[PDB]
Amino acid sequence: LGFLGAAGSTMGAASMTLTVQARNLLSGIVQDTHWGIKQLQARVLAVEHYLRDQQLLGIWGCSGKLICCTNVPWNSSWSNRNLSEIWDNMTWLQWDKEISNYTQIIYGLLEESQNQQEKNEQDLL
Amino acid sequence: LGFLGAAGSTMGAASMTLTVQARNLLSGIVQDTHWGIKQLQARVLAVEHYLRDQQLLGIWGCSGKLICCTNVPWNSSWSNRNLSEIWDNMTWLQWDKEISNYTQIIYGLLEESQNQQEKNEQDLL
Amino acid sequence: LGFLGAAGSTMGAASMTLTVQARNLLSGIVQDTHWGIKQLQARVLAVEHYLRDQQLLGIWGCSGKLICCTNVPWNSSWSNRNLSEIWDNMTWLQWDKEISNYTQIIYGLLEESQNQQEKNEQDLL
């Protein structure tokens, strides 16, 4: 229903449309010396941003998923709201405002829990 | 047996050689101001094409596979040939000619079936 | 403990820190016409190197792993040392010196064993 068409939707409803935004990262497929350099630099920048998202999902064990459950418990200190409000009343943009200061905490924790589990898999094999 | 060495092979036989073509996408690894820009632009373009193929496989749930079965049924309207002809008599280039007008249909359907199944996995967990 | 902080660690201990190096590949995220071109070329080059590592892991069936067991047996001709020395006494840099001439052998074998197994999965389905 358009890129960001789900922006006003609740988080639950919006999670059902995640392929909509994923597919807009590489839209450059469809898309004067000094000028050309700046135009090219823009494409390179878009590529690095794409790759970073993929690397993070990779490290966290969510490389092939749009949605994944993890091995990091939720901290009430990040948010003490219940899931019902978060998924049914609130939208993702609002949610980002609610927890953006913990982005680096959660991400560091995700890296740690996945590293521990990958070691566990190697030891079990 | 060379890049595209399987081009005259049947589709079945050719599927057994898929790593041959996959490995030629990033051959740039082995590989005057105005000229240099054009030379660089070419590398950037190759990268975007590579990434798009990977993203599509990602979205469809085939991110780690050369060959994957999907949750989209085959339409006889795309092709009403039997599998025996398709895999044993016909080559991939011929096949592409047979179904190229449905590329966007199949791809849209693949995105939809995978999105539905990923939701099912999240609800089951 | 820093990039390459594990360089003097044994291979075993160092394997427990692999996320440390993986995360330094895309550090460009944090990071005059003629000059700018050279600066841009450097970013493009870093991207191709990143992608090649990912493609190889992809082909070998280790796309989502930092550590993976494979279907290629170890050749004593590459190294006839026991695992105890390799994992507990020796570091990775030393190990690279011990087996670098077989890099292309092992990689070719990995491509072959994975291609055979992927075919087996498709035939089993």
Next chain:
Amino acid sequence: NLWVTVYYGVPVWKDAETTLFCASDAKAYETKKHNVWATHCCVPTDPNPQEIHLENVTEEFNMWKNNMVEQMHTDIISLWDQSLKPCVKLTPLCVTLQCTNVTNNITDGELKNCSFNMTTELRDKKQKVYSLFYRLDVVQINNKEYRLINCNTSAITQACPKVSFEPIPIHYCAPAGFAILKCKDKKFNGTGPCTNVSTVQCTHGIKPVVSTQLLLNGSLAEEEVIIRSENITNNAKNILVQLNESVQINCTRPNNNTVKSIRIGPGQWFYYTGDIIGDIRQAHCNVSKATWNETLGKVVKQLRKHFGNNTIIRFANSSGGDLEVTTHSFNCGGEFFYCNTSGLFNSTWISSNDSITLPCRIKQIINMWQRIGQAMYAPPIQGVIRCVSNITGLILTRDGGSTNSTTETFRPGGGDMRDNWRSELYKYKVVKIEPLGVAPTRCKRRVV
């Protein structure tokens, strides 16, 4: 009991600054090889769905912090310089000239008849050249000797006679990962939240119009004249007044000019003013008085909501500065006009056309962008120029120094070209999409 769940493809974004791609309007008009904008923004548009509404999404906009104005400024200047760059230079014309008055059919002496020995295609020879000049480009050295006014300061380059700078609508498009948010709120004053928001891949087409003290050929406001300022109460800031109705201004260069040329080097051509057929008249622009009067009364009704409806609004002319600062500057028919504006601001409001003619100056050496650097020389245009432009807004400042007498004085503002572009850009914001994020769920990862 809740666990982190990671979601990728999340419909959220952050304020962001990037470079937009420009496109012509699908090359609807080819322009052949004679238009600079069409040449640069060679990229076509596509009449695809233009917008996506974002229901229940409120976004915060600020037209004075909008980096798209900086991009237009940079791109407009850059293109203009690239366009001029390969053209024939006038270094050979920085000579001493002997001048006399032009008296032929003249009632006002605006023109001088000057002559000199100009370089020809061979290095051994010079050609005597005789032509008429406007006083604005000529300075006395001291039948006196004169020089080109800018030959002590910078090189002068002749604009190629084959290249038009006529504005075409240009659309600006987001790079992958970016989106442009558009505010459609008819009451938006340039700052704050907007609920009527939709996103676009590209902005609509905006013409890269340049003007001083009066906004030309822009869009109109709906319902009422809207006055927008970063700081309403600050007399040091320009207030942008967007009209909800256009006013036409009819401008002309009445002198039937005959253009002459000369080869001054190896394929190096120079075009000169030659002489005038018929008599001499001042350049000028006409505005219907009643229309203008109604327009200001509408502006006053709006000024009163900011300053008090018990006030007196007095209008006055430019306070001082050079032509590039105090006059209404615009390009008409390809020529550069510097018109008087004082007759337009001679009234106050206290709580058969009957037009007004504004005299204009014509100048050929242009100190473009008020930048110190190379000057452009505008080659003469054959015949007579007439054009009609749309007044779509005003740029005003207050004098200040008020003692709260309730009478305030408004004068032409101008200066920075960025303020003209803001007139359309206030509607748009650029953001970066940030698809990766997390939220709690009642779901622990299954560990195997």
Next chain:
Amino acid sequence: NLWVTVYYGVPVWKDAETTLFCASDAKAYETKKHNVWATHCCVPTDPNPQEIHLENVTEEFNMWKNNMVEQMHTDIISLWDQSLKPCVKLTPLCVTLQCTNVTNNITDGELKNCSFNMTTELRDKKQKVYSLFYRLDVVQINNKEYRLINCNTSAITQACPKVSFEPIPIHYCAPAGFAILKCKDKKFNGTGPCTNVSTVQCTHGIKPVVSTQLLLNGSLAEEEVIIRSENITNNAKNILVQLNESVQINCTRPNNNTVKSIRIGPGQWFYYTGDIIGDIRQAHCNVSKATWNETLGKVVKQLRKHFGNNTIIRFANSSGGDLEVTTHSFNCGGEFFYCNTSGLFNSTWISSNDSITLPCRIKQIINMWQRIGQAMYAPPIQGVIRCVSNITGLILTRDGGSTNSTTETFRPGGGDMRDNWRSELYKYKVVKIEPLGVAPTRCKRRVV
């Protein structure tokens, strides 16, 4: 009952247009710092497996729609301009010269003795310069005064005497994701399917030879002369005739030239023709008559399969145009020759060398590519030039206007340099590999 199965790494492709990378032939010969092609295409080749056969794959080729010709055109011109760009300009030579005839040992006056005051390294001084010129570069102004022929049209730049343009074989290589398909069918006429197809990473090395009305130093056809045209029956098109045998042409510049130089600025050096040791002879080229005759008879046997074997094939000379159009233009020993061709096309076929000598003109100011723009000046060459080139094909057109009399007239065609490059490029096509695709299988995804 069948399901979509997705396959990645599928050996298929689409027609595609990209930029190929150029390489020298592994720098087998260094050329030091004196060769422009070697300098630009600094990238080496590697004698790796050169080709992959595609058994049972038929591909469609069309040499007249082959974008590699456009790339060579663009790259050849671009390099030539970059090469000339940093060299000393001859603007200081656009002066008036006094000329007299050169009569010393002359039986035909091709040369004029001209002189002028040339700029020296100090701005205060000029040097009298005396040198001989070919009439083709000199135009009367009107012991008469003359000027360089192009000083009214464009700047003239001296080619650096240190840089050779001698063609070296250049290989063109595909970017990752691309492949070049090569047709080895000995009967391929430039259009249609080819079954003898293999792929390569790079084309073989093709020399960037430039010539008019005669193809030089290209590859030969096997078995028979092959005549290729986009439109055989259209008299307005050039037919490319590829010989299966070469014919040697021996060209010379017989006048033993003494080169003189002068400093004309701050390290700015100019090289002039000086004078001639010995006597004066016309430049010329020699072709054995019998070989040429056999060559045309072979061409006729092939023309007859297109026009009827009951026909009469008449050959005739160029119909009109400038030297760059009507003569055989080539570079020999570094000098630029414009040779007569009419003696080669003086026969018709009706269903002790005994060579023919073709007189040639020598010209130093070169209107390269028949482009309007800066001219190149070719500095003189010391001594005497002799070279032998290989005639490997002809470029012909028909006059048309036929009444079906069965007699047709063939004349030299030429014009566009792209047609010479097509002579090798007809064998190659560029495609893009498209590894991602689908097919039905009796396999539903297992859903867990």
Next chain:
Amino acid sequence: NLWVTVYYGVPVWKDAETTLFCASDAKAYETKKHNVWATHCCVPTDPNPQEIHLENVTEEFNMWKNNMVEQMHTDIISLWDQSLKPCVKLTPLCVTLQCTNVTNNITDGELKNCSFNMTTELRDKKQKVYSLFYRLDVVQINNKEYRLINCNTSAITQACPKVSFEPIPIHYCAPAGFAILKCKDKKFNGTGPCTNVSTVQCTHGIKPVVSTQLLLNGSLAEEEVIIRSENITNNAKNILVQLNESVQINCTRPNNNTVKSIRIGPGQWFYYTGDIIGDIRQAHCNVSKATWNETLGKVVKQLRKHFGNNTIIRFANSSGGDLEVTTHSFNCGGEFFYCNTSGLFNSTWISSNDSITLPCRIKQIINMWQRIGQAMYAPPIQGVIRCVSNITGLILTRDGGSTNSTTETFRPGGGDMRDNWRSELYKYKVVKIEPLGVAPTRCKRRVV
């Protein structure tokens, strides 16, 4: 029984050559718009953790094979040329001048009083210009006529008077995937393994100092003077001597210069030497004798460990060459000095300042980098220059030709600027991280 296990993110690396990014030291000092280095390396530093120790890792270093020196060479030259590029050219000054001796308060005639007609802003007029010049920039043509010494060889461009080249510390940073390994071993002689190794994102800040025959303003050695050479026993190589103590050198340009200017074109400004207030003195530099003596004795103690402690070390002056080769060349206060060094090397060691003053030459046309190409003109500096620099090392060669008499002669070496940069770069190496690798494990892949 073991199987291949693939590990990604492995902490290993290979020797590698890449381009490092440069950064100013967080723009601690702005420099406004007057510093070239600050302008180019606009990128800031960040006082983050600076290093990571690599315990138990031994790395092999070789300062003479270190590609960072090549990068500095390339970047320093490139920036210098970009800086000079947009400045006013002095082509108009390549004229003949009449000169007489300057005799006013002169005891030694270093200066000449020369004059000529210089181009003014109009093409029709010249201005008589009178100014004083150093003999080093003036050559006789033959009250004799003289010219600028380089007007026969290359263009001369005036350095912009607004741009300083004063070295600022510049840090060099690794691209993603690269790391810089730093050796902290106090005894490292430039070649071989180092165990005291840590890695950094960036090198510390190194000033891009240029000098001949003496290293200035670098870091000091700890504990002892360290002599480093690729080939100690080869008399053809430079030995770099790093001091563990600095020696100050006080240099001056004592003549109180009055700077004059002229407009020579359309905003084209030229600055000339004018005249001198007061009397005339030679430029010179002062070094305390005892400090210098101690410094050489320390150098001798170290030379003896390489050549024998039963030796005699004799020092001698430059053997021959131009000023750029034989003198101590440096920039002081913005001026270019070429100082005598012979008084510093007049001693031998056999197993109230009392300073030495070294006379210096001042030259304004600079043959920068000893490259054939455009020359730079250094505009005059108003007033008197005094500066003090730090001698941090010496560059020496041996004469060789030894008969094993045990007496060896050491003379100033110099030449290549790369050797100065090596003085700091010897501590750093660039490597590429190679995260993907394998090892055997007792683990077969589970096959499903």
